[PDB]
Amino acid sequence: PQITLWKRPLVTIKIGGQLKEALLDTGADDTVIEEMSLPGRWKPKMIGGIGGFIKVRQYDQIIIEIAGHKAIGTVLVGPTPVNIIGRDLLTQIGATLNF
Amino acid sequence: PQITLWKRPLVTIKIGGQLKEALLDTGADDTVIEEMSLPGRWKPKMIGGIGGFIKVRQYDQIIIEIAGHKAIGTVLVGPTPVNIIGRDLLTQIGATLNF
């Protein structure tokens, strides 16, 4: 698809067996999801942006289905105000910005 | 152009006759620039990012070039870690997300 940007580019994702709504975000290095359980090992991380930093749990090699496309990558889990699909997974589905 | 996302989608902008670097950010509703001087009056705005809410100065109808494309519109000035071009101005330069 071609997604215009008149509105927030929200898509449905499946992660950890759960459906969630998430923002396709070229300005995010990594994927950041609201509190949820994920399997396997993790390590703490601090990520920052407008308003400062939050503490997240970094899970690697997590499978996500993004608007019908499967991808594997890093997911950060923490108190994010919106679920964000970042560049680490956008690349895997071949997403580009065009103008 | 067609911009892949393996690295940050940074472009050159021109505002106030000055060249600056900015991030093309589909996850940003608004355009937010680091502290600079702009003409005219400003109005207050609060925006909420990953770490919480901040106060910014809103300047309207500002001429800005983005990657060689002219836009005219609202610019928020405040303590952002990086200059971000949000959907307000991405729509003006005809940007879309594609996969």
Ligand SMILES: COc1ccc(S(=O)(=O)N(C[C@H]2CCC(=O)N2)C[C@@H](O)[C@H](Cc2ccccc2)NC(=O)O[C@@H]2C[C@@H]3CCO[C@@H]3C2)cc1
């Ligand atoms: C390491 O991975 C990440 C680190 C930080 C972020 S972020 O959410 O802080 N952010 C990074 C951007 C902003 C600074 C920078 O260098 N890159 C992703 C953004 O797209 C973010 C994504 C976002 C975070 C929180 C709420 C809504 C969207 N949007 C955002 O801050 O937009 C600002 C806030 C206002 C709300 C929406 O638009 C308005 C303008 C995401 C993943």
Ligand SMILES: [Cl-]
């Ligand atoms: Cl960060």
Ligand SMILES: [Cl-]
């Ligand atoms: Cl590619």
Ligand code: NA
């Ligand atoms: Na893992």
